[PDB]
Amino acid sequence: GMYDRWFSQQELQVLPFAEQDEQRNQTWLELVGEAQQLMGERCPADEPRAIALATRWMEQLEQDTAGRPEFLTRLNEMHAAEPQMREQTGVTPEMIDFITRAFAESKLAIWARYLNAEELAFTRQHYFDRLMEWPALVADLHRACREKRDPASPEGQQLAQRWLALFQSYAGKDAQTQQKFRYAMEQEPHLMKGTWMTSEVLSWLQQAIGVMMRQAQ
Ligand SMILES: COc1cc2c(cc1OCCCC(=O)Nc1cc(C(=O)Nc3ccc4sc(C(=O)Nc5cn(C)c(C(=O)SC[C@@H](O)[C@H](O)CS)n5)cc4c3)n(C)c1)N=C[C@@H]1CCCN1C2=O
Ligand SMILES: CCOC(=O)c1nc(NC(=O)c2cc3cc(NC(=O)c4cc(NC(=O)CCCOc5cc6c(cc5OC)C(=O)N5CCC[C@H]5C=N6)cn4C)ccc3s2)cn1C
């Protein structure tokens, strides 16, 4: 079995995509149908329909991976490697790329109200630079939260420093710009949609960052 070569039996018990679910299949039929439509029209990634689709799409993926970021990586790799996956779902690499760009536009459209033109141009340019490293970090943040580790611990501060590096890769290294991203997150919860970042894990990360800022302040 395809799913058996890609996931452990313990993972297949927790993976919603493993379970039969007619509602979920109908939802994905509609998501893929709308993607094909918009791509057929050559709809730009910043069009309101593209932004709305990408948001719903990523929220659906968050549900169907049970909020486990490492299952997103696995599913992307399966789609790249397994012709049977592309047949089953109708999701093409072009489609994943379209959704990836529209999802970025959905964040940039919110940030545009909190950043100056220069900060937004930097973030638009550098958004994708280290994008692929986020799932592994979000996974480790999920583990640190569940294993109720101390944000102030050396291992907690290793996660805070890893977060800072990935964040600065798209935000830049200006302390004032970082506070604008923080303010945007506080004012616009919709920024967190499709990021695998639950309020519980964000709260833990916020504590770890708090410690990091005050040590060498
Ligand atoms: C030590 O503190 C406490 C201790 C105790 C406390 C409380 C405590 O709380 C007080 C601390 C509160 C505080 O001053 N905090 C803080 C914060 C900041 C700050 O700068 N935040 C920030 C900025 C930008 C982003 S941007 C962001 C973020 O996450 N971005 C992001 C996420 N993703 C996923 C991405 C991506 O691009 S990936 C995109 C997707 O498509 C992928 O697919 C993902 S899979 N970007 C976060 C932030 C945060 N500053 C400056 C300060 N109380 C309890 C305990 C009990 C005993 C005593 N205690 C305690 O000991
Ligand atoms: C870097 C970090 O990662 C990212 O940033 C990122 N990762 C992503 N990943 C994705 O987008 C992903 C999407 C999905 C979707 C799934 N979907 C499913 O499991 C699924 C779908 C379904 N679907 C169905 O029941 C509907 C019947 C099949 O429909 C068709 C079938 C159909 C074609 C067309 C079809 O419909 C129009 C076709 O023309 N065809 C196309 C060629 C073949 C021919 C025949 N087949 C069920 N399930 C269970 C699973 C995993 C992923 S991962 C996106 N971003 C932004």
* Ligand 1 contacts CB of residue 204 (under 6 A): no
Structure tokens at 41: 């029209």
Identify whether residues 90 and 151 lie together within a single domain: no
Give the CA-trace dihedral at 209, 124, 77, 58, to 10 degrees.
Answer: 80
- CA 96–ligand 2 middle distance (angstroms): 9
Identify whether residues 45 and 63 lie together within a single domain: yes
- CA 24–ligand 1 middle distance (angstroms): 32
* Ligand 1 contacts CB of residue 75 (under 6 A): no
The DSSP string of the chain is -HHHHHS-HHHHHH-TTTS--HHHHHHHHHHHHHHHHHHHTT--TTSHHHHHHHHHHHHHHHHHTTT-HHHHHHHHHHHHH-HHHHHHH---HHHHHHHHHHHHHHHHHHHTTTS-HHHHHHHHHHTTTTGGGHHHHHHHHHHHHHTT--TTSHHHHHHHHHHHHHHHHHH-S-HHHHHHHHHHHHH-GGGGTTTT--HHHHHHHHHHHHHHHHTT-
**Closest atom of ligand 2 relative to the 99 alpha carbon:** 56
Identify whether residues 86 and 124 lie together within a single domain: no
Burial of 122 (0-12, 13-18, 19+ CB in 10 A): middle
Number of domains within the chain? 2
- CA 32–ligand 2 middle distance (angstroms): 6
Q: Is the dihedral of CA 171, 150, 195, 184 positive or negative?
A: negative
Mutate to test the pocket of ligand 2, among 2, 28, 70 (most ligand atoms within 8 A of CB): 28
Domain final residue, candidates 111, 139, 165? 111
Identify whether residues 9 and 104 lie together within a single domain: yes
**Using CA positions, which residue lies closest to atom 7 of ligand 2?**
76
Please choose, from the candidates 139, 80, 98, 1, the residue with its C-alpha nearest in 3D space to the C-alpha of residue 89. Answer: 80
Identify whether residues 20 and 68 lie together within a single domain: yes
**Using CA positions, which residue lies closest to atom 17 of ligand 2?**
89
Rounded CA-CA distance 20/25 in Å is 9
Q: What residue type is assigned to position 55 of the chain? A: T
Rounded CA-CA distance 53/202 in Å is 25
What does this entry list as its resolution, in Å?
Answer: 2.2
Domain final residue, candidates 86, 111, 136? 111
Identify whether residues 103 and 129 lie together within a single domain: no
Identify whether residues 143 and 84 lie together within a single domain: no
Mutate to test the pocket of ligand 2, among 20, 32, 98, 128 (most ligand atoms within 8 A of CB): 32
Identify whether residues 28 and 107 lie together within a single domain: yes
Identify whether residues 139 and 66 lie together within a single domain: no
Domain final residue, candidates 111, 140, 172? 111
Identify whether residues 76 and 130 lie together within a single domain: no
Asked if 102 and 54 touch (Cβ cutoff 8 Å), the reply is yes
Identify whether residues 138 and 199 lie together within a single domain: yes
Rounded CA-CA distance 126/49 in Å is 24
**Using CA positions, which residue lies closest to atom 34 of ligand 2?**
90
Identify whether residues 51 and 124 lie together within a single domain: no
Range of the domain at 159: 120-217
Q: Is 158 left (phi over 0), alpha (psi -120 to 50) or beta?
A: alpha
Q: What is the CA radius of gyration of the chain?
A: 18
